[PDB]
Amino acid sequence: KKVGVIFRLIQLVVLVYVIGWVFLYEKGYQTSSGLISSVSVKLKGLAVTQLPGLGPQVWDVADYVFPAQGDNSFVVMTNFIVTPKQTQGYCAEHPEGGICKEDSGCTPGKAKRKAQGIRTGKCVAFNDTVKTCEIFGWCPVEVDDDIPRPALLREAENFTLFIKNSISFPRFKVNRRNLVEEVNAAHMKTCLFHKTLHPLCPVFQLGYVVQESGQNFSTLAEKGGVVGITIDWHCDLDWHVRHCRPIYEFHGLYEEKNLSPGFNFRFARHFVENGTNYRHLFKVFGIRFDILVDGKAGKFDIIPTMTTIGSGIGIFGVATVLCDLLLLHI
């Protein structure tokens, strides 16, 4: 009778699996659906800089967010080098293009790599001790060898980021916003997001977001960096929608490998003064924030329920037949 006792145990273990795991845990009675998301970001916070060339400079949201309209990926400026009042003309090329001593060491034209301008074939003086090729281009050339340290916009640590995420589960016609029912105006007036204390506030302090990605804002501010923000919507639509909540994770890794460690870009502000076209060239160091929204909604459906029941019946039958096979041999 011991073989018969084993038969029953195996039959029940199989039934316990088929129900508890496949039907209940894995939710085999549910049809699944992905989402389509929209993310809007608003930055708040102010930075002031005191350069030697200029006076106090105010940096508000319109000036330190790239793009201004926002996106899933956006940059907050944390440092910059500015080359003001650049004009198109002839100047000494930056020594990174090459250092010459005579006019014969310059070839007219463009460098094969990282050309700064059209070489005129003339070796002119970059400074009092270095002579470089004369070029036609934006003059004076940018000198970005000294990255400002501490970062010019290191006050961006206290900037607040408001993420407005609108998601739709199109199959189930369910619309959710990360501004969930628990979020009200009083919360939006004072709340700052906290992984455990305030996991639903959609206003994030930038320094907290960088800290939670495992990075140091002081290091990321000087040369730039990347913080990934994931918003996950794992919703069981058999329950009320008020349980369909977003989960926030922050990702990032800054290493001292010193091979392109940070993030920077160059942009220019063009203007006309005294009838001549000028530009301000900025090398902008900043943290790029990538906001990735994924999710999965499940709702009970009859067709998955029957299909799962059929699969469980098949699993149960195969098990019984193989056990009758194994016992025949034993």
Added chain:
Amino acid sequence: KKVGVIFRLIQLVVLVYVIGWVFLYEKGYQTSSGLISSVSVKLKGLAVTQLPGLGPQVWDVADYVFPAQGDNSFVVMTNFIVTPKQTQGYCAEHPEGGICKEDSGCTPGKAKRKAQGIRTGKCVAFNDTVKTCEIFGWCPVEVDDDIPRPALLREAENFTLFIKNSISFPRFKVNRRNLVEEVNAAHMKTCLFHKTLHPLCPVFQLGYVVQESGQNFSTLAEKGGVVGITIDWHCDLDWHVRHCRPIYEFHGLYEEKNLSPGFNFRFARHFVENGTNYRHLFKVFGIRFDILVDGKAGKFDIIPTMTTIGSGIGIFGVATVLCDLLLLHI
């Protein structure tokens, strides 16, 4: 013989499932592939505004599309508040930062939240009846309490959006454009997209796109909003490519919850006048259009066909054995 009759029915029902559903409907004879897509958008249409501060202002595509080069996510401006000729200096801070009565009610420095400038510790007059902290910043401060109603660019309803979607099924080396063979120059000259009448015209009226997402353009224009546009490519590559067509759906939900209901951003136009740097500050209300392109191409392949045949043979055999088991007990 009734048991034998049932045996045959169950055997055939199983065969009917294995062929008709798994092989034919679910297309188990096909290998599947996702796509890689590119979306370009061109807006057309003009808006004119008549502000009290300025004269008639023309708003063409270069000015109301953010970004100008386009993207999967782009904003069309439908309303704005403009603060012209802002300069960096000292002014009264906006009363939203706090209302003071004496110089002692102001602390020099920055507010912890939503700082507008560097407080100087002086309580100056915002208007004839309100006194606020004096700040260093962009002056005069923006006053965006009165959103223009009706929307300044409510004529954007008649703007036309041209979506050019290029998709590739890299596994099958198949390239498709949403400008399908049925779309010609004569169509692009006059066609407007219609869910049923013109489901292939790639020129969309903005108001129609908002209406089809379930929203009201008049409401979305004043404070902004979001419309999701999905392009789906469900193509059976056993047929001619001319049947590989895109399907357009429009998604969106505007609610009167009054907690961040619309969409807005701030951007600045910088300029130099009389040797002093100025900026025009715009608070731009607009509809963000997210274009999501997904799809799936199937082509007959021999390996899925054999694997499906093996799976069907297994299903048929398991069924017969379990039926011989059930009949043994019956």
Added chain:
Amino acid sequence: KKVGVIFRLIQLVVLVYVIGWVFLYEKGYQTSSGLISSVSVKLKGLAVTQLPGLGPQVWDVADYVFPAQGDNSFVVMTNFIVTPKQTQGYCAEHPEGGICKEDSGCTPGKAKRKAQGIRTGKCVAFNDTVKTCEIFGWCPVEVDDDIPRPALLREAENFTLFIKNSISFPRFKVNRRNLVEEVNAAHMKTCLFHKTLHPLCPVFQLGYVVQESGQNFSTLAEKGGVVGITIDWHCDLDWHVRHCRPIYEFHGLYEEKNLSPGFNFRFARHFVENGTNYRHLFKVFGIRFDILVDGKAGKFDIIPTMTTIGSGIGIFGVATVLCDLLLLHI
């Protein structure tokens, strides 16, 4: 005994499949994970243009990359038409809006499609032989009928694109950059990517990228185009991370169908001169580069290993029972 010999062969063939394919090839012992990616791009290279209206014009990275901060999708300008010093006023509308002969042929207001301005009801002269509606708008109207050929920025072929891709496998806590251990500073100083010679250099020549997508840079430069760049991370995390490498593919199809073949957009540079607001209107033809990053990391896990073992046991048992069934009938 021949039937018994077949039984064993089928049993072993089944075991060979269950191990070699399912366990070893398909890696059924591994748990899988997707990635979250961040892409930053830096363009380098210079172009000079010699228009008849202006002098030599220098085009560096800040001016020919849209957006300047970069994105997954970005545009490199390869051609442009410029309408300088546009002001809001009254001018002759472009003849594409319609050609009139009398003032009665113009209706005040806006065109239903592709409106260029507010018609005043007056038929004025566009040129010495064409009369069009007078409009209020940006004047003079852009004339983009003659696309510059050869392309004004056809030197963009030699521009170099640096892709910095940071990916994370969040389930396995593995961070990878496309600047893999084999890439050093000496490589970044001189390397250009090559499908087979230098498959790991993250600096791409634009012309090479277009050639590898199957397109001609000369054709794409005049009217614009699209090149898709895919970065794939198919990593087996049972091995060292130094084997987690990116694979680059380039996608694109340019056809002479002449129905919206290229890519272009319009953007404006606004400025103030002599107390009047002006703008430079650019119609920018360029190649849009879409960078798509996908990947899959597998690491050995005990739960998939046991589940695969159970599936293989089930497959083996079903096979033996059906073979005993087939042999009973034979």
